Amino acid sequence: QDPVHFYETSYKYQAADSTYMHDVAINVSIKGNHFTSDIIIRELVKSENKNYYNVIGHGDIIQKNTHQYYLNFDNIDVYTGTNKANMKPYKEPTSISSLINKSNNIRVVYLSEEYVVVEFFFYDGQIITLHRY
Amino acid sequence: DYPSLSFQQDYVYIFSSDFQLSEELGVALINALSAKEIVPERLYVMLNDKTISFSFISKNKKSKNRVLSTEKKLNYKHISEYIVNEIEY
Numbered sequence: 633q634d635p636v637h638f639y640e641t642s643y644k645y646q647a648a649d650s651t652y653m654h655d656v657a658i659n660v661s662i663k664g665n666h667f668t669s670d671i672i673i674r675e676l677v678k679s680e681n682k683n684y685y686n687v688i689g690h691g692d693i694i695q696k697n698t699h700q701y702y703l704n705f706d707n708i709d710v711y712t713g714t715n716k717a718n719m720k721p722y723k724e725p726t727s728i729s730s731l732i733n734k735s736n737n738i739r740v741v742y743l744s745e746e747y748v749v750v751e752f753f754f755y756d757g758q759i760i761t762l763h764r765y
Numbered sequence: 766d767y768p769s770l771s772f773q774q775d776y777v778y779i780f781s782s783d784f785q786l787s788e789e790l791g792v793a794l795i796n797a798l799s800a801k802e803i804v805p806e807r808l809y810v811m812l813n814d815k816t817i818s819f820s821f822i823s824k825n826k827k828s829k830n831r832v833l834s835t836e837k838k839l840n841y842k843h844i845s846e847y848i849v850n851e852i853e854y
């Protein structure tokens with residue numbers, strides 16, 4: 633019976649040494665306790681787009697309460713390239729490869745029909761708003 | 766766990782384990798945004814060990830979401846100034 637729900641947002645990241653910034657688009661779709669997600673990262677390292685990353689992930693989303701969820705990835709794939717039109721597979725670094733071995737915590741701090749605000753596991757802790765569609 | 770809600774006033778929601786820092790930053794944010802005549806629908810801020818993040822929510826617009834990595838710890842003034850500049854720009 634589970635209908636598909638769509639979520640989307642973006643954020644910008646400023647590195648500690650401020651030598652680069654990331655513009656990160658997040659798309660996630662949920663059906664029952666299943667999810668698939670696409671994340672696109674545009675790396676600006678000279679005020680100039682010089683790298684792109686595409687991260688695809690899917691797995692289960694488990695509900696502890698109406699405000700507490702966890703993501704159990706079955707697989708995460710990464711692609712890279714200096715042009716979005718010609719992306720190539722990229723060998724997962726063991727750090728990112730190991731996000732599959734951690735139930736990744738998602739805490740809802742505000743829930744609405746048009747958007748949701750969560751604390752989640754990027755950077756070991758990030759607050760973000762996701763828009764519903 | 767993630768930090769819980771440690772300061773809340775008007776449109777501001779601060780998530781940090783430092784209650785004193787949370788209030789200092791919350792008051793500084795409210796004063797700085799009023800000085801800019803900027804009123805969010807809601808403004809969520811999360812302070813972590815090596816990162817700050819925030820979500821500026823405005824009615825019928827995409828949220829403005831930001832993350833700042835910090836190796837040096839930033840004081841409440843610099844955090845407030847960062848958020849206020851990112852929301853403006």
Ligand SMILES: C[C@H](CCC(=O)O)[C@H]1CC[C@H]2[C@@H]3[C@H](O)C[C@@H]4C[C@H](O)CC[C@]4(C)[C@H]3CC[C@]12C
Binds near residue numbers: 687
């Ligand atoms: C693997 C590449 C390249 C890293 C490198 O080897 O230099 C990373 C560059 C940007 C990262 C992503 C980016 O920082 C945003 C996310 C952050 C989060 O902590 C992990 C997943 C992320 C989605 C993450 C996954 C790994 C990449 C895609």
Ligand SMILES: [Ca+2]
Binds near residue numbers: 708709710
């Ligand atoms: Ca993989």
